[PDB]
Amino acid sequence: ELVQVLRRGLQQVSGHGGLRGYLRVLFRANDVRVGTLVGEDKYGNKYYEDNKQFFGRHRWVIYTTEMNGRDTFWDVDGSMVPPEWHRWLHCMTDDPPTTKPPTARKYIWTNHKFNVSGTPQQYVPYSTTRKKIQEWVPPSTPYK
Amino acid sequence: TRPTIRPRNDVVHKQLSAFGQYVAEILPKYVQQVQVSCFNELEIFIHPDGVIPVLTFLRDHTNAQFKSLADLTAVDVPTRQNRFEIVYNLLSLRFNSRIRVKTYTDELTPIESSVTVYKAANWYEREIWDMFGVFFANHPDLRRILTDYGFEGHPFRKDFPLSGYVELRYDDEVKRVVAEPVELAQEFRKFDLNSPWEAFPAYRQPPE
């Protein structure tokens, strides 16, 4: 029984792409589990499943190392997940976007964006309405 | 009329009317009115001088035994000469009943404190004094309970503005929290929601 769990650990080491891949996933995700690859994102994220872990650990994402413009080898966050995989990953549905793709609309963003707070791309509020009162303009010609 | 309408209970209505008559008979000196609502709640309107007697009766009489003071509060009605209305809600565990006693006062007339009858009143009366400015005579310790230290005015009064008169901020010149006249980036937007058509004909008032 102990030798079986040791073999399972060795299999986990081997199944991540050798020692380099094992160390990469251990230092990035703080986890070394192996699951079936559900899908691959448009931005490089990978989504894995394993139904033998309990509810909460049965789905996970390994984030990409390079999002729109920044290096996300170390700095990753939850806002990097596109909305379809956002629905799959938070267990709002049992259908991955690979098997049940979302509806296509011309106005839907073709490029997901993470939380851009603290960057030059941050949203700045302003009044969207036009000027209420128009002032009289004096004539350009002298009066006397 | 069955599914969507709350059912009636005439037995409780009769019992509450009988007990209201009983209380009015026993205390003619202070009882001014007795009512039973359509959902079986007994209300007793009394003169302000009968707060201590009536409550004591309701707590100590063998047939009343209203041992619990559920709630004590005030209501502000500016159109009345006696602006403030003092409401006592009492619970009787022996007879599994609830009663309500109402009296009145204004800004300058003190109300006798009921701490001797009910200990629970001690904070409630304080709260009334804090929120409406009704003074309670012979209170063991009557002071503000809910508002900030040095707060001026009584917020639960109807003429008190919703956002108050002062607001707080930290000032670095004096290195402390300061109070300034209130200023709002967005003023509260008052809505006129009342319909110009009558809703309940049963409550129509004589047109003078």
């Binding site: - | 969507t4 609502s37 709640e41 509060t73 629970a120 904070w123 309970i145 809910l146 929601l193």
Partner: protein, 386 residues
């Protein structure tokens, strides 16, 4: 001269916003003076400026450990004033989620009391169950705690198609968690020494000081609102009321644990007896119509418009409606003037009366005893301060 000490508001055992001014002789407590209002938000005055539907989330935020119960009390008051009746399935849903809310509140109370006394471990064990119940809340409403699910005509939406099974799965296992908690605390001599004969209150003093709920039943007073004045369907469920004998912290702890067990019993009964039908009163002048009717029917659209802009009018009157909330007797004195906005709303919270009596219970006790007494009263200052 005694030492004067500020206990809180920034204190782990002060529950956030309590300023207990204590006069101490050594460590003996000579006087307790609770300064409150550090969480006074002026809820009642704000309610005076909203419609009846708009005032509902305030009751969520009142006692933020028992949300559906506050919603239920407010809804019962408004239904009594409106002379309407919720449908039976709505009442069963209300009682089920009220019992779940009682479980949540009792977990929070017992675990925080143990943490204050020093037992840090059961907090983590029971907050996972609290998380699962938050999941139930979110599945039924979309919010983990501030649901606003219970409305003055019934409930907002129907249960999702797989929720009853998950509730049954949680309930069939919660008893072992209670058993582990009791193994941790019930027979421990340190726990008993910290709690036995601490904060002893007599039955008469409890009645006069305005106590309610466990604060009464620990002294031997055989009282419970769900048994004596049942409101929704509580007359159709069988459960037992735990009664104390010594009036101290230990008896109240035992009463709360047994009340968790009885809530499990009631939850089982509600799960078995859930009936079919509609979830809100079939009166479109009070409850909004369905979205499909609002987009097809002229009357439905008009009533949707008027209900979500002005609201329904409540006939003039005044009521006092009380329920057996997990912390005691939670009441609303509601005054309507015939309009679509409440004229006056006074909230009666058991924490107010229980805290007003902390000085009486703390006489002849030490600082740690006062910490235990604060823990045993189950005080949340959102409802105390309002």
């Amino acid at each position: 001269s005694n030492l004067t000490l500020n206990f809180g508001p920034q204190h782990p055992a002060a529950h956030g916003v309590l300023r207990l001014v204590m006069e101490l002789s050594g460590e003996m407590v000579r006087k307790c003076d609770p300064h409150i209002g550090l969480l006074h938000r002026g809820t009642e005055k704000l309610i005076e400026y909203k419609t009846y539907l708009q005032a509902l989330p305030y009751f969520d935020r009142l006692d933020y450990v028992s949300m559906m119960c506050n919603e239920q009390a407010y809804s019962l008051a408004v239904e009594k004033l409106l002379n309407i009746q919720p449908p039976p399935r709505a009442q069963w849903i209300r009682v089920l989620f009220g019992e779940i809310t009682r479980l949540l509140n009792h977990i929070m109370a017992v675990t925080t009391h143990a943490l204050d006394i020093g037992a840090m471990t059961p907090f983590f064990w029971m907050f996972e169950e609290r998380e699962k119940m938050f999941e139930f809340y979110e599945r039924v409403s979309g919010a983990r705690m501030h649901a606003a699910y219970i409305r003055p005509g019934g409930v907002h939406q129907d249960l999702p198609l797989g929720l009853l099974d998950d509730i049954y799965e949680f309930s069939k296992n919660f008893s072992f968690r209670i058993d582990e908690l009791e193994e941790m605390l019930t027979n421990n001599r340190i726990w008993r020494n910290r709690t036995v004969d601490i904060g002893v209150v007599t039955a008469e003093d409890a009645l006069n000081y305005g106590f309610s709920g466990v604060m009464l039943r620990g002294s031997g007073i055989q009282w419970d609102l769900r048994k004596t004045q049942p409101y929704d369907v509580y007359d159709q469920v069988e459960f037992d009321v735990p009664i104390g004998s010594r009036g101290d912290c230990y008896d109240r702890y035992l009463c709360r644990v047994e009340e968790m067990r009885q809530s499990l019993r009631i939850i089982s009964q509600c799960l078995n007896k859930m009936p079919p039908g509609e979830i809100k009163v079939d009166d479109a002048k009070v409850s909004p119509p369905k979205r499909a009717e609002m987009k097809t029917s002229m009357e439905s659209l008009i009533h949707h418009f008027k209900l979500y802009t002005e609201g329904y009018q409540v006939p003039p009157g005044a009521t006092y409606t009380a329920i057996e909330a997990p912390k005691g007797e939670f009441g609303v004195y509601l005054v309507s003037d015939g309009s679509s906005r409440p004229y006056r709303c006074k909230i009666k919270a058991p924490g107010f009366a229980h805290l007003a009596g902390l000085d009486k219970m703390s006489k002849g006790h030490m600082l740690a005893d006062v910490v235990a007494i604060i823990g045993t009263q189950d005080i949340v200052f959102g409802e105390v301060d309002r």
